[PDB]
Amino acid sequence: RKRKRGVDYNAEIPFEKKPALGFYDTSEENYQALDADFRKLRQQDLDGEL
């Protein structure tokens, strides 16, 4: 791969701004990721019906 930018997208968060924090503790809670299911999944299935 020969390019300056472009590999910066999957490697990390592109021009990352952390959310400004305050008055409520937001360190314990976290989100549950997406179920892969790589035996039914289609490129059409992620983007949805146009």
Next chain:
Amino acid sequence: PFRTQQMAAPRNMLSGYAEPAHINDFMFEQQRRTFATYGYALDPSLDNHQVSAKYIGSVEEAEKNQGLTVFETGQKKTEKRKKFKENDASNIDGFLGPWAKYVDEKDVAKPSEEEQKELDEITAKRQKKGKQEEEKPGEEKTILH
């Protein structure tokens, strides 16, 4: 109690306090070469205990040689190294005025008789990683299924 050694010290930029001094050049370089030559010098800290005058270094050799500097005539004078001399500048390809090598120590220093072979082994260890030679594997492999 909510501060560390760095956070409790009176610091100016992340590692301590830095302020412009105005020490005399000669005395500064005197104590600098005093430490660089023998291993001791006087203390340039400005309080540290606020009593008289302490030496900071290999303080055991300080009292042995009376606390002398480089600008002063030394106590010890012995074991001079012997060098060639041809100060005449009249014989061509024999002159060495201040370019006079010592009589004892000599030029190119090979390591030893075993150290060379060990360095050859460590270069061979470097060679196996570069890798570039690969024979076409004709090794036969058979049996009876």
Next chain:
Amino acid sequence: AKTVTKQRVESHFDLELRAAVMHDILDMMPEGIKQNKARTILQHLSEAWRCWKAN
């Protein structure tokens, strides 16, 4: 910062007129208007100038 020399004069005039109209329609609309519709008014300005040249 490129200078407006001789080949940029008309393009820069039309670049600045359009910005002036943008400012004036942002300040002319009252308080609760949807703040779209700048492009359409600029198209009408272009059409009024072409009808001016066309008499």
Next chain:
Amino acid sequence: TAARPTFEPARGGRGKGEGDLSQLSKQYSSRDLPSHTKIKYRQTTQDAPEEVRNRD
């Protein structure tokens, strides 16, 4: 497409004199040479501010 208006201009502050003098460039034009290196001031008959202060 290719032919398009602007709808947003360029913002100043990111080049040649804008933040660190483009990190101190050694590039300079002919128009950036020393020229008119002395401010003229208004003289006593011209309209100096002392002369303009007492006037009705």
Next chain:
Amino acid sequence: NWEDADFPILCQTCLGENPYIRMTKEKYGKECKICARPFTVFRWCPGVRMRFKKTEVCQTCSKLKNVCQTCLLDLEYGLPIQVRDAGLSFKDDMPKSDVNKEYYTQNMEREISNSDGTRPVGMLGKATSTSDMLLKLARTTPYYKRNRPHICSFWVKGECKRGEECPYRHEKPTDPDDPLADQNIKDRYYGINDPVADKLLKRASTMPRLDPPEDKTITTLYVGGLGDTITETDLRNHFYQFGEIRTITVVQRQQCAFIQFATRQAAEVAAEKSFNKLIVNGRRLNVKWG
């Protein structure tokens, strides 16, 4: 942007064993090994047989991560950054990909140059909470083998024609079949797969440490090395910190003191505070379970 700040941010094992230093200042000499923007390079000689060390990173890239500009170790402890972030949290997440790195560097430079110029801008609040295992393997006295001239590569081919005059060492380089040999700059700086820090963490994990209360609700503490020179009146004065103290059985014949607390949480907290740390009356007090 350029960096341009006077008088670098240095530790004591690189600044030398002489209190009198002559350093040179070059205004925009090198580019940073991390930031890749040019900074003010300071060049000094620590001692007599040293190497003329110089600063490798910006003032800014040392303010981000509270390190020395040439050994890239913590100013307070003298340890790699992976060890210190192991004994802390890791919430910096400095970007490594290109445009993100220069963008993050620009924004943090504006952040630092919109502030005082004294504190490790993000590491400060987490730098309050400290004294984990890193203090029990912090180096006590400076390792002056760092400031030391590299192996003479002409002496490796047995062809050093300078001989006795060469200022480079005539001694063995390390075998490259070693994990302790690769060591990139950015690997040492971001805290990622640093083998020195790996070995320090492997040592600090096998450091002697607390065991849990194997049987339920037992708060009994088995104190060996109690000593016959101390008093039990001082024991309660050290021990009412934790909570509702229950009975304290004292046996001064085996030098063992037995302790009971209200909840097992208080006994675990006491195990945390006490084990292999607590020295009272200048005499080590050993506490165990069972």
Next chain:
Amino acid sequence: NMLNLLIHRKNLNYLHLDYNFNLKPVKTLTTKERKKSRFGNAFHLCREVLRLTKL
């Protein structure tokens, strides 16, 4: 040496500055190589001044 270090830093290996400061292409150039290797009045003024001094 200065003029052909300027040539070799620009990777223009297809140009040749002779010993009398005549700049000639070694081969027949593409359009891209010809646009890359166009110099200005600074290079050619310095080259012709050096031609006069070498004469």
Next chain:
Amino acid sequence: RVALEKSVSQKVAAAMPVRAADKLAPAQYIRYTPSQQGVAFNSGAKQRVIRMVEMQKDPMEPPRFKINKKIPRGPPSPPAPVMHSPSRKMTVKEQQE
């Protein structure tokens, strides 16, 4: 005016980079307190004095590093509260007109 003239001089120094090319030897001293004390560090001392000489610049040397590298605009300073009035109520009639 004294603060502005210094920045003016630093800008204008580019306009003539080499006319009477520069001079540099105010070799200065600085006293520094390591904030690391616990002494095995200076040798037993609390401070250290450092003589700073500025490195002498080569007249004949071009600029060293690429400066043309270009990056997008960072975040602006944190938003100010907007302080408007309650807001006049809007009618369907005027919204359509």
Next chain:
RNA sequence: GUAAGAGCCUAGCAUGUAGAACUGGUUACCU
């Protein structure tokens, strides 16, 4: 029918770096 993407192929211009973390442990009472 262009000397440019792309896209491949082979190439060569800068560095002279920072760093090497390695040692401690006892047992005991009444029914």
Next chain:
RNA sequence: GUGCUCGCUUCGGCAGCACAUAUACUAAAAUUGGAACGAUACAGAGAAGAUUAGCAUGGCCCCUGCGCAAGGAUGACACGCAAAUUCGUGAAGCGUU
């Protein structure tokens, strides 16, 4: 190293004193990575039919130029299921209170 030493004192050595006071991006290297615009295959000029002068706009695209000139195909890119907060009528059939 040189000189003075009403220094021992010979013309050999030593003693004292004076003057002289800290070079070096420390390499003849070991390494370490990134680039070129050339071939070699596929490829072919923007403006709603065709042939086309151009001048702009914007920036994580630059090149030639001393250029705040001017060129680079109008230098290239730009072609998009272009959906941003926020709803309701009337009649009919079925089940429900």
